[PDB]
């Protein structure tokens, strides 16, 4: 789907068996969710920004608007669910103007 | 130009007769700048977001790679030039996937 911007880019995703709203972020480089649990080991790691404290976990499966990808996800204090360039370079996404 | 993610996308921007690099961020709501002085009155606001203090410029001239855009500016402390949503509908920027 081709999405203007005009309203945030809000798409919903599923995973690890719950769905979710969250946003596609072209500035983030990382994918970062709110709190909740998943499968495998998790190592804990720094994020930086403009105004955190995340568990980072890999090989974890999203599907976001209906595509699956798999990569690293982290699980932080978040006000929103970011889906960042690490996955967005995997659903195929991209900015024209 | 069809921009894809594998890196950050980063463009060249005019400001206030200054080049400068910025994101093309689709997360966010506002553009925000770091330091430099513009024209115009400005009032205090504060910005949220994941890991602040800014004022904020309006009607202010941007040229993006290119196409020019006149809006709201914000300035301040921040680690990067954002170009968000609110310019980024002037250039007519869409995500596609
Ligand atoms: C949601 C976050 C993961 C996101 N941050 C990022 O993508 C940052 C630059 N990258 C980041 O945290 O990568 C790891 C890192 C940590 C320490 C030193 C170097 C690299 C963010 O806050 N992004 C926003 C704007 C922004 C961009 C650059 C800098 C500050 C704010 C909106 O796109
Ligand atoms: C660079 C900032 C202006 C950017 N923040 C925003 O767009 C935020 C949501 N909006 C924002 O600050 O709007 C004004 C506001 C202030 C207080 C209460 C309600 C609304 C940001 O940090 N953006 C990042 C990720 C993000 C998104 C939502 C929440 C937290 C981090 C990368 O896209």
Redesign the pocket.
């Known amino acids: 789907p081709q999405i203007t911007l005009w309203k945030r880019p809000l798409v919903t995703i599923k995973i690890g068996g719950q769905l979710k709203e969250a946003?596609l972020?072209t500035?983030?480089d990382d994918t970062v969710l709110e709190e909740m649990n998943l499968p495998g080991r998790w190592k804990p790691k720094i994020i930086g920004?403009?105004?955190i404290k995340v568990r980072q976990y890999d090989q974890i499966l999203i599907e976001i608007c209906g595509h699956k990808a798999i990569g690293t996800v982290l699980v932080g204090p978040?006000?929103?669910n970011?889906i960042g360039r690490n996955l967005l370079t995997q659903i195929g996404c991209t900015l024209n103007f």
């Open positions: 946003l972020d500035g983030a920004g403009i105004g978040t006000p929103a970011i």
